[PDB]
Every structure is written in structure tokens, then in C-alpha cells.
């Protein structure tokens, strides 16, 4: 919130897609990591 001069140096047309894309990739990697290292998330996917 004090970093607001960064768009004078970084092009927001490149940096804002890079930010949103990095956040989305990170969320997929965390979900995959939890799916591969727990029994309860595969068991929730399985049901029955």
C-alpha cells in the first residue's frame, strides 16, 4: 500500500496480468500439493 509508485517503472499492461496469473498458478499448486499429500481431500473427492 506504500508501493504505489511501481507503475511509474513497471508497465501495468505486463505487470497486472503477471500478478493475477502468478496468484492463479500459486492457488492451483497449493491445491495440488494438498491433494497429493492428504487422504481426506481424495476421500472428499471420492465420497461413498
Amino acid at each position: 500500500m506504500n508501493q504505489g509508485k511501481i507503475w511509474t517503472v513497471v508497465n501495468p499492461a505486463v505487470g497486472l496480468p503477471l500478478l493475477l496469473g502468478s496468484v492463479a498458478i500459486t492457488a492451483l499448486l497449493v491445491h495440488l500439493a494438498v491433494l497429493t499429500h492428504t487422504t481426506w481431500f481424495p476421500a472428499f473427492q471420492q465420497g461413498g
Partner: protein
């Protein structure tokens, strides 16, 4: 293209409000995970 100092501060308010909205949804999702999952239990 790169912005004026004033235009940069105006854009960054939307980036910070977007990150605060994401943080709030993630705080509700972590509380729901604490309540419904064997995590921390």
C-alpha cells in the same frame, strides 16, 4: 505504458482493494477449512 506518479497511485488503489478482497475471501475459506476438515484438529 508506464504511468504518471498520480496515475500510478490511482491504479495501485484498485490493486490493493483487489488484494484485500482476495484476502477476505481466503480468510473465510481458511475458517471453513478449519471447521469442516481434520486440519489443526
Amino acid at each position: 505504458a508506464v504511468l504518471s506518479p498520480e496515475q500510478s497511485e490511482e491504479l495501485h488503489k484498485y490493486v490493493i482493494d483487489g488484494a484485500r478482497a482476495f484476502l477476505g475471501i481466503a480468510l473465510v475459506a481458511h475458517f471453513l477449512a478449519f471447521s469442516l476438515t481434520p486440519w489443526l484438529h
